Structure formats: structure tokens, C-alpha cells
Design a protein around this ligand. Structure first.
Ligand SMILES: Nc1ncnc2c1ncn2[C@@H]1O[C@H](COP(=O)(O)OP(=O)(O)OP(O)(O)=S)[C@@H](O)[C@H]1O
Ligand SMILES: [Mg+2]
Lengths: 116, 135
């Protein structure tokens, strides 16, 4: 009987790293709207996001985007554990690579147009 | 009557066209003695005796149909050029954009108003491959 197992509903916000929660569930769960949470999913795959608040969100349901939903191997109506983690530090080198199907038309630059 | 008070600038290897006498006729400027290009003056003796030669297989003929054989439908021919010319001129660029082109264009009108002609002219002038299915 834990208050951290939550179930995915449809997203309203448009960002790729924002999850939403209702305010009494955050106050029970000891979360503030600037925190940096850790999210576990099926096949032991986990994700990291920024939480914010909502009133249209219920307590038994969390609202997350499709990009987070596909990086956790989760579909609509499945179970995900959330936990606070302020153990996140900054970085030095981050290595990114495009995926082969979406980059067959354009050639030239990719840093200043997209990532900047 | 063609070169009289004209002084047409010609070059070696060009095909030109003359109308008159219920027939159009082609010629090719084969050889100039001040090589290669000149202006036809009354000084020039013009050799018009010999055998009419064969074509090269990539010489675009003048009995084909182009946009100058169509009259009276300026607006519609402008619309068909706007729909069709860009996806057939630049296939790679237009695939690289990510917009869909049109794919079905239905021409309609009364019988005898030149629909087969318009399709044939757009096909010749863009240089695309052209397959004709008849009903
Ligand atoms: N706008 C036009 N400008 C010049 N010649 C035209 C024009 N419309 C028709 N013609 C002449 O009319 C001939 C017959 O036109 P078609 O292309 O056969 O018209 P059509 O759309 O084929 O009519 P149907 O229904 O197929 S019989 C053409 O070969 C041209 O000689
Ligand atoms: Mg016809």
C-alpha cells in the first residue's frame, strides 16, 4: 500500500521532459514543482524528468508525453514507480547520434539548426 | 524571302525552321567557311544541293507538340504547370521537403476542346516519361 505506484493517462502539456502530478499526491509523495524525478518501467528501463503541477490531473493517474512513454516501454494504463532524486549532477561530454531513417533527406549541418 | 532584310545570326550545327506552302520545313546549318558562326549577308553563297540527311536520335523534333500549339486556355494551362512542373522538375528536392504533391488531376470539358493535346504538351515540355492508356 504505497503512494508512489502510478498509472499513465494522456498528456496535455507539449514538452518532452515534463511530467505532471496533482498537488495532494505531490504533498503526500514529498515532491515540489522544481524537482527532478526518477521513473522506473518495464524491462528495467528508467527515465528522468521535471515534474510540475496540475488540477485537472487526478491522484491515481499521471500524465506524460509520448516520448517519455516510449522510452519506458510503457503503454496507456500501465504501472510506473516514481521517486525523487536530487542526486543529479552536471556533465562534461555528451555524445548524440541521429537515427538513420529521419536523416535521409537533409545533409550539411545539424548542430546550429536543431540542437542549439 | 527568309534571309531578305533579316541578317540572321547563324552558327554551325543549328536547326532552323521555315513555314509556307501548306507545310513546314526543317534545315540544318551544316558548314560555314568563316567558322563557326556568322551573319548571313548577300555575300554568302548558300549551298542547297545534296541529300536530306538523317536525324540524330536525341534531336528533339519540331513536329512534336508544345505549348505554342494550344490557344484560348491560358489560365488552365497556368494551373496545370503550377501543379505539375515542380514535382517533376525536382524530384529529389521535393522528396527531401516532406510535402505531399498532387497525384490525381482530372481534366474535363465538352468533346473536342483539346484535352489529349494539353496532356501531350505537358509531357513533352517537362520531358517526363509518358505512358498512354486508352479507354
Ligand atoms: N485549344 C486548342 N488549340 C488548338 N487546337 C485545338 C484546340 N482544341 C482542339 N484543337 C484541335 O482539335 C483536335 C482534337 O482535339 P482533341 O485533343 O481530340 O480534344 P479532345 O479532348 O480529345 O476531345 P475528345 O472528347 O477526346 S473527341 C486537336 O488535335 C487539335 O487539332
Ligand atoms: Mg481525347
Amino acid at each position: 500500500n504505497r503512494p508512489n505506484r502510478l498509472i499513465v493517462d494522456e498528456a496535455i502539456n507539449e514538452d518532452n521532459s515534463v511530467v505532471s502530478l496533482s498537488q495532494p499526491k505531490m504533498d503526500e509523495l514529498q515532491l515540489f514543482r522544481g524537482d527532478t524525478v526518477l521513473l522506473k518501467g518495464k524491462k528495467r528501463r528508467e527515465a528522468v524528468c521535471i515534474v510540475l503541477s496540475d488540477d485537472t490531473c487526478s491522484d491515481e493517474k499521471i500524465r506524460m508525453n509520448r516520448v517519455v512513454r516510449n522510452n519506458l516501454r510503457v503503454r496507456l494504463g500501465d504501472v510506473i514507480s516514481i521517486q525523487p532524486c536530487p542526486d543529479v549532477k552536471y556533465g562534461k561530454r555528451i555524445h548524440v547520434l541521429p537515427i538513420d531513417d529521419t536523416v535521409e533527406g537533409i545533409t550539411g549541418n545539424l548542430f546550429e539548426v536543431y540542437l542549439k | 524571302p527568309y534571309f531578305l532584310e533579316a541578317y540572321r545570326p547563324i552558327r554551325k550545327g543549328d536547326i532552323f525552321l521555315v513555314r509556307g506552302g501548306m507545310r513546314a520545313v526543317e534545315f540544318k546549318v551544316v558548314e560555314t567557311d568563316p567558322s563557326p558562326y556568322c551573319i548571313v549577308a548577300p555575300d554568302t553563297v548558300i549551298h542547297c544541293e545534296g541529300e536530306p540527311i538523317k536525324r540524330e536520335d536525341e534531336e528533339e523534333s519540331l513536329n512534336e507538340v508544345g505549348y505554342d500549339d494550344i490557344g484560348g486556355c491560358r489560365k488552365q494551362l497556368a494551373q496545370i504547370k503550377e501543379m505539375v512542373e515542380l514535382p517533376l522538375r525536382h524530384p529529389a528536392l521535393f522528396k527531401a521537403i516532406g510535402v505531399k504533391p498532387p497525384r490525381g488531376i482530372l481534366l474535363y470539358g465538352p468533346p473536342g476542346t483539346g484535352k489529349t493535346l494539353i496532356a501531350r504538351a505537358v509531357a513533352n515540355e517537362t520531358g517526363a516519361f509518358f505512358f498512354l492508356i486508352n479507354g
